[PDB]
């Protein structure tokens, strides 16, 4: 799991599960995105994404890094 996990930080407010899943599924099969919400009811700058295979995790990073989502770069880190 930890191998297939990948943290996402500094994501735009409207960035929800559906859009992130759409973005990340095209490169390869992705299990799902986890967004444990704070005491606010809105997506946080912090979240995680779990992919079907860890081999796919780097390529997404190789393809996506601070991409212009909603006119706002989004950073991605490892475990």
């Amino acid at each position: 799991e930890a191998d297939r996990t990948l943290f996402v930080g500094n994501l735009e407010t409207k960035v929800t599960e559906e859009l992130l899943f759409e973005l990340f599924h095209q490169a390869g099969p992705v299990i799902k995105v986890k967004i444990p919400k704070d005491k606010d009811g809105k997506p946080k700058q912090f979240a995680f994404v779990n992919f079907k295979h860890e081999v796919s995790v780097p390529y997404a990073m190789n393809l996506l890094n601070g991409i212009k989502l909603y006119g706002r770069p989004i950073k991605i880190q490892f475990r």
């Binding site: 095209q26 490169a27 991409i67």
Partner: protein, 158 residues
């Protein structure tokens, strides 16, 4: 359960290759402009995530009596502009963000081709005699079913 194939609805469903207008809005770029990732994507190559999906592994088991891996060529993903020629109306915007024109290796064709006992009357005394129930007749369904597959692999081998 076998029929409980609802795991594919955690939040929705999508398809590979195609680009949704909602995704275009999310990325901040409309459909007229070529996707920026494609640049980097064609500077990276074919994603390995779907490569495993199209790859079938031959079992190595051998009979201890006293690899040319198989790939499903029909499952190849479509990535126009990298593997397939860019659709008309979309110029080769390799000068944006830095990239090169779609290469033959980057193209789909090259990658694809690269690979004593009481009498009976006494018994019926004092108890209701047995009666037939649920009387019915054959509906012929088995006959028609058999007629359908008249020439089956078993039959043709007979």
């Amino acid at each position: 359960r076998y029929h409980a194939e609802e795991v594919e609805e955690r939040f929705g469903r999508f398809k590979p290759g195609v680009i949704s207008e909602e995704l275009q809005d999310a990325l901040g770029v409309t459909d007229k402009s070529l996707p920026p990732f494609i640049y980097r994507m064609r500077q990276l190559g074919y994603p390995p995530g779907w490569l495993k999906e199209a790859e079938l592994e031959n079992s190595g088991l051998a009979l201890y009596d006293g690899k040319s891996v198989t790939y499903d060529l029909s499952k190849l993903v479509n990535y126009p502009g990298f593997n397939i020629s860019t659709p008309r109306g979309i110029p080769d915007e390799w000068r944006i963000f830095g990239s090169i024109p779609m290469q033959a290796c980057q193209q789909k064709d090259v990658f694809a081709n690269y690979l004593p006992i009481p009498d009976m009357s006494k018994f019926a005394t004092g108890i209701t005699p047995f009666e037939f129930e649920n009387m019915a007749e054959s509906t012929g369904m088995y006959l028609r079913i058999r007629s359908l597959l008249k020439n089956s692999p078993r039959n043709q081998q007979k």
